[PDB]
Design a protein around this nucleic acid. Structure first.
Ligand SMILES: [K+]
Ligand SMILES: [K+]
Ligand SMILES: [K+]
Ligand SMILES: [Mg+2]
Ligand SMILES: [Mg+2]
Ligand SMILES: [Mg+2]
Ligand SMILES: [Mg+2]
Ligand SMILES: [Mg+2]
Ligand SMILES: [Mg+2]
Ligand SMILES: [Mg+2]
Ligand SMILES: [Mg+2]
Ligand SMILES: [Mg+2]
Ligand SMILES: [Mg+2]
Ligand SMILES: [Mg+2]
Ligand SMILES: [Mg+2]
Ligand SMILES: [Mg+2]
Ligand SMILES: [Mg+2]
Ligand SMILES: [Mg+2]
Ligand SMILES: [Mg+2]
Ligand SMILES: [Mg+2]
Ligand SMILES: [Mg+2]
Ligand SMILES: [Mg+2]
Ligand SMILES: [Mg+2]
Ligand SMILES: [Mg+2]
Ligand SMILES: [Mg+2]
Ligand SMILES: [Mg+2]
Ligand SMILES: [Mg+2]
Ligand SMILES: [Mg+2]
Ligand SMILES: [Mg+2]
Ligand SMILES: [Mg+2]
Ligand SMILES: [Mg+2]
Ligand code: NA
Ligand code: NA
Ligand SMILES: [Zn+2]
Lengths: 51, 66, 33, 104, 137, 238
RNA sequence: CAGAGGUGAAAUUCUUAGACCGCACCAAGACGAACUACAGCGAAGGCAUUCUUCAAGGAUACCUUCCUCAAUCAAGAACCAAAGUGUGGAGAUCGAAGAUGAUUAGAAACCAUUGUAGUCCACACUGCAAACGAUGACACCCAUGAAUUGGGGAU
RNA sequence: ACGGGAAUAUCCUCAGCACGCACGCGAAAGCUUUGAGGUUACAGUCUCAGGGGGGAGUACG
RNA sequence: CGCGGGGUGGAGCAGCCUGAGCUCGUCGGGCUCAUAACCCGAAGAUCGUCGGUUCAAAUCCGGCCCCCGCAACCA
RNA sequence: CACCAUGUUCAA
């Protein structure tokens, strides 16, 4: 696992990974537009369809 | 350039320190002119009195009554 | 002003100071037992 | 300390009602009960006498036979703004009971 | 040329002037009777350099005179008038430049049609800015 | 302010030369047919001017639309929706009518009851309108009371009679006849005459009419509404 | 098309990638202006668009019924603005905390631009208000003028 | 047609929120059939609270 | 001990790449009944110390007196 | 509607 190992239990790299990451590297928060506690309103999730 | 006006009434001294006089001015123009007998309120610096004459230059702005 | 001499700080803030003091004392006793 | 007004500065007798929904002050927006706020209905001319004369001269619609429109506004002030704007002034104690029931 | 309609010389061509007069700026905005097409829009900030003078009557008068010049260029010789203040939940009192702008349009030769106040007025509203204590200055 | 803009772009021909003039045409139930003129961009590429002209709403004063009417017409504005472009004529259909703000605000008085009624009705040709009637109570000639507030049961009775009359009168007529009734105050005089016995009224008036739903577009019905269409000389040579 | 916003004056802020402004719309959440009053209703807290509904409640009217069944109340019970708490919704506006810009000797205040929790709804808690008429409840007597809300009687 | 209707006018009446108005009361401000009146000429009935200012609505339970 | 950084007006800090500035502080005069705030002025260095080079050293290169860090690991 | 902070202890 990419998050494995270390003398402390930690992810040593940012957990937001690119949409284009190959399988095996695409773990964590996949293509996250944002992170952290949501405040002031939950936006609608999913892909954006202007139609 | 400048239009001559006649002070037909002294409305009273205005502003703090009382150095500005508010007056009613009749524009002096020949008959048929667009400004013939047109009266406007103006603020005057210096000692003025009724029947005095002023060079107004601009004649559009009207002094706020006080 | 709409009140007479308080002879002290504003009573609402004195009440709040007491309220914070009571909270501190009950926390100290909690850690003790 | 001492009761300054019999009505306590508002039109809410002791057994009339409990709460009157407050309004925003016309000037500062302070919330004050509607029965307490100083209320004035103002009918203001859109133009002063000189400007109205010039616009009426240029207007084929407005003239001696048709009057220009006016502004109509209900203005409610908090007590502080009413006093500061001189809509209302402190009065002698004996004159505080004088009430007007129509615009003079 | 003059870019006017195919009308006889002297016929009244009517636009609509929207005069938004706040306490910070004055808008003199000329459109057609539908409001979709705008001929000219001049504000007090386009005539003065200081922020505190944007709402002054002189700035509004200067804005109106440029409006008249462009209206003559566009072929509009008469104006219906729609006056407004800020409105909404804010003040309903028209700004200082309201009277000067309308007077400047009349004195510049532009004909004046129907005049109406179109200040947005809520029939119930959201909460105005400022606390329940109001602005404390 | 002049000379104060710092960030102009965020990245780093005469306008009136492209405009053509059009006449706006009210329906035949208005004496002045060619009220108002407007401009529009010339048809360029795929952007046809008619496609952006349809749906535009024009507002005019009723006294201007109907000459020799009276000062009562001067406090109402009528709006029209452009339904079809015929050459340089914008044939329109009724959109809304409203009393001016100054007139409506002046009607308000303190020591009386303000009674408001909302009515929705469908005409014979499928137009749906909302009617927004407002009425005011008045003191009698010999009244000595300090107010003329109305009993609530009479207010509801006034609302129901107004609703019944408006629905009955407007549901069996076309939009053209309905506009004629509204703009000529035939319905208004009928309402006040039949509603005064319920409650003494200082004044009753229709303050706003708005079309809320239009049927499918019909070219023939529009032409029947416009009758003889005055010619437009905007496209002609000077 | 070149500024807009905001202020005592400004700046934070928005803006040729088109802001502000104009017209007609669409979405969403609040709110029910003017009329609105020394006016109404409610035990208090509280309550304001219309229509359709569900149980109430006071007053008035009566040559109806009844027959002391009442008054006030430790204990006990239910309700109780705002803020606050829990779980789901909702989140337009305003806005504790916080952020930035001003003012100032300092200003982590008042002012300006923002902004979290909240503000709104359902259910369940909380029961701390200048919850004020700072005036306990029931009952009796009590002089004068002008009004006002509701129901009756007379012309 | 919510129609033998609706609202006014004069008078009477019961119930309600009140206003300027005589006794009397109160340290006074003021209250006054809406008492804070009818009380040293002190007794209609019930009930809650107060006993110089602070410490303090705090500490403990 | 090895490597690196730093000693500048009373305080903190620039300039540290040859020919002294910033804020506060202090002094004098105003304003105030007086103090503070505010306004007008003035003074205060020898660039830690000792040498060398250079026509000229806060500056450049050496040693010294101190100050502050990074390292001092495998058994 | 820029910005106005402070005045040692008794006693006349
Ligand atoms: K008041
Ligand atoms: K109170
Ligand atoms: K009542
Ligand atoms: Mg790996
Ligand atoms: Mg790891
Ligand atoms: Mg862990
Ligand atoms: Mg971890
Ligand atoms: Mg005082
Ligand atoms: Mg006390
Ligand atoms: Mg006092
Ligand atoms: Mg009060
Ligand atoms: Mg009641
Ligand atoms: Mg209350
Ligand atoms: Mg005229
Ligand atoms: Mg400005
Ligand atoms: Mg500006
Ligand atoms: Mg103040
Ligand atoms: Mg009445
Ligand atoms: Mg309403
Ligand atoms: Mg009892
Ligand atoms: Mg709450
Ligand atoms: Mg959950
Ligand atoms: Mg905000
Ligand atoms: Mg309590
Ligand atoms: Mg009571
Ligand atoms: Mg109490
Ligand atoms: Mg009643
Ligand atoms: Mg009395
Ligand atoms: Mg006794
Ligand atoms: Mg005691
Ligand atoms: Mg002293
Ligand atoms: Na790390
Ligand atoms: Na755009
Ligand atoms: Zn105010």
């Amino acid at each position: 696992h990419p998050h494995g190992g270390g003398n402390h239990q930690h992810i040593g790299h940012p957990s937001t990974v690119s949409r284009h990451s190959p399988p095996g590297q695409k773990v964590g928060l996949i293509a996250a537009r944002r992170t952290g506690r949501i405040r002031g309103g939950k936006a609608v999730k999913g892909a954006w369809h202007p139609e | 350039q400048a239009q001559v006006g006649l002070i037909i009434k002294v409305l009273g001294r205005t502003g703090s320190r009382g150095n500005v006089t508010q007056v009613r001015v009749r524009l002096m123009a020949e008959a048929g002119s667009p400004d013939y007998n047109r009266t406007i309120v103006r603020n005057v610096k210096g000692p003025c009195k009724e029947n005095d004459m002023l060079s107004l230059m601009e004649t559009e702005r009207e002094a706020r009554r006080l | 002003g709409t009140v007479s001499r308080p002879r002290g700080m504003r009573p609402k803030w004195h009440k709040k100071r007491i309220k914070r003091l009571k909270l501190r004392r009950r926390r100290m006793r909690q850690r003790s037992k | 300390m001492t009761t300054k007004r019999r009505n306590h500065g508002r039109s809410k007798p002791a057994h009339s009602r409990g709460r009157v929904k407050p309004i925003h002050c016309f000037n500062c927006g302070r919330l004050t009960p509607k029965d307490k706020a100083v209320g004035r209905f103002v009918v203001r001319r859109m133009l002063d006498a000189a400007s109205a004369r010039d616009v009426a001269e240029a207007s084929p619609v407005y003239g001696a036979n048709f009057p220009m429109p006016r502004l109509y506004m209900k203005q409610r002030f908090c007590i502080a703004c009413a006093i500061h704007s001189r809509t209302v002034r402190a009065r002698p104690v004996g004159n505080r009971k004088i009430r007007y029931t129509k615009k003079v | 040329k003059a870019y006017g309609p195919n009308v006889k010389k002297g016929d009244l061509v009517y636009g609509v002037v929207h005069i938004f007069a706040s306490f910070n700026d004055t808008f003199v905005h000329v459109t057609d009777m539908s409001g979709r097409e705008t001929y000219v829009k001049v504000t007090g900030g386009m005539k003065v350099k200081a922020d505190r003078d944007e709402s002054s009557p002189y700035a509004a008068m200067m804005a109106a005179q440029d409006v008249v010049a462009r209206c003559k260029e566009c072929g509009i010789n008469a104006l219906h008038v729609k006056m407004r203040a800020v409105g909404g939940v804010r003040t309903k009192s028209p700004g200082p430049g309201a009277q000067a702008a309308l007077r400047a349009l009349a004195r510049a030769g532009m004909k004046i049609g129907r005049i109406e106040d179109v200040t947005p007025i809520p029939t119930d509203s959201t909460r105005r800015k400022g606390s329940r204590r109001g602005r404390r200055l | 302010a002049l000379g104060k803009n710092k960030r102009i772009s965020k990245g780093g021909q005469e306008t009136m030369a492209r405009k053509e003039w059009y006449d706006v045409v009210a329906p035949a139930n208005f004496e002045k047919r060619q009220f108002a003129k407007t401009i529009c961009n010339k048809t360029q590429g795929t952007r046809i001017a008619a496609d952006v002209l349809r749906g535009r709403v024009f507002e005019a004063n009723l006294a201007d639309l109907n000459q020799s009417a009276g000062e009562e017409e001067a406090y109402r504005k009528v709006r029209f929706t452009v339904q079809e472009v015929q050459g340089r004529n914008l044939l329109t259909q009724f959109h809304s009518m409203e009393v001016t703000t100054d007139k409506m605000a002046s009607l308000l008085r303190k020591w009386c009851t303000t009674m408001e009624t909302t009515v929705e009705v469908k005409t014979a040709d499928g137009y749906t309108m909302r009617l927004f009637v407002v009425a005011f109570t008045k003191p009698q000639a010999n009244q000595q009371s300090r107010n003329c507030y109305a009993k609530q049961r009479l207010v509801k009775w006034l609302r129901m009679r107004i609703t019944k009359m408006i629905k009955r009168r407007l549901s069996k007529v076309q939009i053209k006849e309905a506009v004629s009734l509204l703009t000529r105050n035939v319905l208004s005089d009928a309402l006040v005459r039949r509603c005064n016995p319920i409650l003494p009224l200082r004044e009753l008036r229709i303050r706003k009419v708005r079309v809320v739903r239009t049927p499918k577009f019909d070219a023939q019905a529009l032409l029947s509404a416009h009758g003889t269409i005055p010619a437009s000389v905007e496209a002609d040579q000077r």
